[PDB]
Write a protein that binds this ligand. Sequence first.
Ligand SMILES: C[C@@H]1CC(=O)Nc2cccc(-c3ccc4c(c3)c(-c3cnn(C)c3)nn4C)c2N1
Ligand code: NA
Ligand SMILES: [Zn+2]
Ligand SMILES: [Zn+2]
Ligand SMILES: [Zn+2]
Length: 226
Amino acid sequence: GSRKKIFKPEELRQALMPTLEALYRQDPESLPFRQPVDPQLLGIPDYFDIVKNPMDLSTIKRKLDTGQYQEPWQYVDDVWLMFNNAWLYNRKTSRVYKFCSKLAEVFEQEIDPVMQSLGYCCGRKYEFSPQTLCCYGKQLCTIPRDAAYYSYQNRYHFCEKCFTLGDDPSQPQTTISKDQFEKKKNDTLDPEPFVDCKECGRKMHQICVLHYDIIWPSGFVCDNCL
Ligand SMILES: C[C@@H]1CC(=O)Nc2cccc(-c3ccc4c(c3)c(-c3cnn(C)c3)nn4C)c2N1
Ligand code: NA
Ligand SMILES: [Zn+2]
Ligand SMILES: [Zn+2]
Ligand SMILES: [Zn+2]
């Protein structure tokens, strides 16, 4: 009897379908996304080499219609899987890529009040900005958002101007082949991390619900469960 919130299918369908309809309403931008990708019909036979888990509006609608989502973040995840597949497969200059970006703008403007009506802090999946990275070359030096840099193992980073590795003064350093590195751009957004309400079990964002002047020695409890 731990007060876990169980979402019934009709609750999720009634709340979330208007956000899906807002995407469907976009003409022309929803047109590439209204049906499952058919690589042979479209003439893109390499599609499933790149996209391992396809997703589209019709599949999301069917999942809502048949109760396949236990909680609304799974719906949010499917919407972003659809977007991320298209941003990966298609070139930035292509119409499908640009249409995807329009759909994502619409979704971000629709999802927060809907998720709030379901008891959540908001519906935003990703952090607002790429995290600032540390540059190994200098001590002061850091890599800001949208900056170019080099990275081995997604661990050790050098800004391009600075570009014998170690992560601690006592750690014996190792020589790594320069240009074993990959050049990257600091433009990736990570998912906003969660904390679960210990009563209802809802996943809430740490940044949304945990404040600099509040402690939770016995565990986080959301506003509606207090
Ligand atoms: C998401 C899916 C697969 C994908 O990642 N890239 C892709 C490449 C070529 C065509 C389409 C595609 C498929 C179906 C489509 C369309 C495009 C369009 C369409 C309408 N206007 N424009 C520019 C494309 N309508 N339909 C039903 C497409 N989209
Ligand atoms: Na265009
Ligand atoms: Zn939030
Ligand atoms: Zn540097
Ligand atoms: Zn709660």
